[model samples]
Target: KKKWDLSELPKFEKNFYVEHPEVARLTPYEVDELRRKKEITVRGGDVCPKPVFAFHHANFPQYVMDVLMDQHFTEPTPIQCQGFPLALSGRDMVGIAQTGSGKTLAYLLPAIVHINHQPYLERGDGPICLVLAPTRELAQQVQQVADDYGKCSRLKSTCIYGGAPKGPQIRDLERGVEICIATPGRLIDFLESGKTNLRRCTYLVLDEADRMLDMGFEPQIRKIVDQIRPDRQTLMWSATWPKEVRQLAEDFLRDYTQINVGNLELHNILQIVDVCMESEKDHKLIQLMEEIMKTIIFVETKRRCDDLTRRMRRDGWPAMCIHGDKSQPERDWVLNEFRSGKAPILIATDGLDVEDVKFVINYDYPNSSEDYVHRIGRTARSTNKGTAYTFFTPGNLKQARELIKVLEEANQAINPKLMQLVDH
Candidate 1:
């Protein structure tokens, strides 16, 4: 493949602000009201009267509140408001919430606040907080959120992940960052290399715990957990809590409180099913692309990603593809193109779900329910309601069955069409 100049791509005339008028028109008060009403609070290990409200109204340091406001975080999301106080008060917690529920800030703010309250650390005694995520993209995303929230604080956060040059990560580690966000694989590599130490890691957060387990990072996570001090505070946050995640929590959490928000529910995305045969997949995709102005199509493999992009281009739809196989720079360029509306259609694999994708399409049903949840999560994020369309075929029936079972357990109604496909 030739090197492409992403800047050369033409911008779309239909602006997202115009297309999604409600998102832009939402007043701050309205946004806060929406969040307040939609937010659910649950007690984790111990039930305390007024725990949620008390935590929400807790006295955050003036400096921390200023930093939050400066970063455009005017109000705390429900999860943040509820989880912050407990985590900051040195209690272990297990927070369950959906993506885009501001769960990132829930753990981040508390960690920063705790750090701010403590005395300056001696040299080689930093990294008081360690956050472990499933994928490099999620680790980076959490780091960005932490950086934004802690912009004015003297504290610093560094993200460690794979697929990028390690020199920068090593340099960041050497500089003594206060908070370290990392993916298990790269963090394990660094630990094995004896370059990073967790002796001072007083706060540990397992972000997306279920995804981490599903991605085969459980052993690495356990290793990381074992390396951290037993006295350290731990927090586990996940979108959905499977039996495996619950078991891991049982093994790891010591008198940890479990906070379960509303049952796993679909976002406000318009879920549409396009029933098509295996042979007609591409044709249906093309037809859907022509109908939707800006969309993302999820594929299964890197080759399919490239093929889909090429086919879409041949059909005259400005499209792009992003996958784990793409270089970091290329992936960034493709994402920028999609977000900037230069590329209306983004063909990608499950990798795209870990990032902040605007819309999603299940070109084929994922092999697992967890994959399905993360796939649709790409859309309807950051207070922007989006749409997702899934292309269901006969071959995907088994996966669909598992997905429906998961959804039904979560209280989300399965689309009848999907059931029909699964039955066929």
Candidate 2:
């Protein structure tokens, strides 16, 4: 019985710019080609006037520009090219880009710039920018980026997630910070316990929002936002725009701008599910083990993750494990070790933002196709190509059918025998 009103959405003029045109020096045709190369697309909210060819070409302050040069963060990713201007201008934005598309910096740069424009905090109450992440590793990754870029500008940030000491987090909140990167549960606890207030919080960022929702944190996320100031700038970034993510945008964002950087379908990496008895997965993994030094093996459960790690270690392969059972500190250390190449192979049902992972093994296999996609997705990020292997046995007929569907849709090759197994 009701129709939505579109005439009431906010609109603005786009006739302003800080012209440092020689920064990247791209001709009109070149700019169009670059956007095309990235397969960039934009819709909803404000019409982006000029794509930022360079950081200096945008309207950010001198220090913000300084950090860009110091960090050698040249060649803004396509998502950054379009998302930056809208973000810097205080638009609530929902950006869809492939994982490893430099999405962290896409929003972080603008968030820091926007925060710098506000009054400096003289008390230990709340942050100007609050970034919520799905996992502790991702949250710390964002904080690391903030630290690397913001260190030059004196913009302090702290990350607080579960399994870590709450005292230090409480102290960090009380002592004051410009940015606070946290997971939903801990953030909610602090907000409710009077350790931090959102009275001054103006920038809200939900990094990997799709994963967060999938992990079942929508209620907590909604509550966290309800605590923020109504006048804040909200940004939601997800790799894909599923129906749930769309509903999330409607619930939280106000007339947000939407940008899709590439085909959202999961297709970059090579997908395979090699058949073998569960007892023989070890031997199969050993063959592919030499393919890539950095590999992540996803098991079906926490117990399987631990058992696999033990078996891999005993089989003369050094490895580590991370799952719900591992404490926050343990997970953090394991990830750091993995990223540093100290421990190249990791086994878990969950994971991180590692580059150069040449292979991802589905040790126990996923129950659904979507899980299979992201499980292998730990590699073949950005422009790099990688491969994934799954240990598929007769017991996995159910998983085989779902995985077959996803591979076929991506135009990837599949085993006809597996299809027969499903039908029979």
Candidate 3:
């Protein structure tokens, strides 16, 4: 038996076929200038690495180059610039960036590079890379990206989540794959059932780490991470660096490099709040909806969402609603309709992320400031300035202080009536 020992090799070995040029040594001034120019702020206490600038500079394998061109990815996005080099250097990373900033590819491409150099898996071996997302939608999105790259790279991948049947997922595991994109719940079930193991996992990612924290998956997350090797390279990507998220990073990540592309301040969003009585809200909402093309109206309850949708439809407007109570298929169809403009307006109790949302209306105020951030984030998409309107009532006075804090963080002007509800 030939015993394999990879300890002698470098942490990040280049693909045998890649003839990349030498990396540039950046001075302190050069690093700061690059960060300022790119609107990036990083914290790792190490020198910053130069960005690829263009696709060819990364010296990706021919297949990766083909996929990049196929997807019309001309060059690295802002997060990709700083995130790529840091991850490729074999360091754990916590990437904080705004949505639609190409965060997915930043960690993913480096993961592929790591997998490419690892020993090939034999039968019964677990995936070499594991990506954990909070929701099935996000897991599926990650799986699509992996499949797109894997198809050409001759790598196999699978997605595991709760709603889907276990048979197919177990079969996929039995056959073996290079990548596993999953949510925590079903993955734990699989782990308990002895379907797969993480012995071969070297690259691990927590996509939307902030949301996972919000979803209350810490214990399950801890159990999952404990199974992976202690020396495995880990990455956590969050849009906001809250205290909890920062603490989670401290617990899970080693001496990690943190790439902060931008702050949570949604500069491109114009936030407006209305203090009105319950009876008057309908009239004001009608006025706001008159000229709007695409808007997501958020309410506090599923009942309210359905009622608002019915009211809008009765007023001769195309509207739809999706809530947790709805079937998964119905929710998917509703989102597709909203995305295609078949339904010009969507009402929801909690969530859905559709880009090009020109407006977000908090028909009923959220209880927490974090929820407010997520609600408004729906409108702030790539390069497009959007608007968010919130209706404040005495019933929501408990959250007034938090709402005001969020407004101030984004430099939004607060109405005096709403401000009066906040204690000094």
Instruction: Kindly report which residue pairs in candidate 1 clash with one another.
Output: 44-257, 44-258, 44-259, 45-257, 45-258
**Residue pairs with backbone overlap in model 3:** none
Q: Give one digit per residue, the lDDT tens place, for model 3 in 2-78.
A: 22345752354422223235436556687678778888876535455665556666666678778888888756887
lDDT of 2 by residue, 188-279 (tens): 98887889877667788999988998899999998888776555688999987666787899888887777788864543566776777877
- Global Cα RMSD, each model: 20.6, 17.8, 17.5
Alpha-carbon local distance difference test for all models: 0.70, 0.77, 0.80
Q: What is the C-alpha local distance difference test score of candidate 2?
A: 0.77
Find the candidate with the highest TM-score and give its number.
3
RMSD of 2: 17.8
The TM-score, computed over Cα atoms with residue i paired to residue i, of candidate 3 is: 0.59
- By TM-score, rank the candidates, best first: 3, 2, 1
Q: Return the top candidate by lDDT.
A: 3
Clashing pairs in 2: none
| TM-score of candidate 1 versus the correct structure, residues matched by position | 0.53
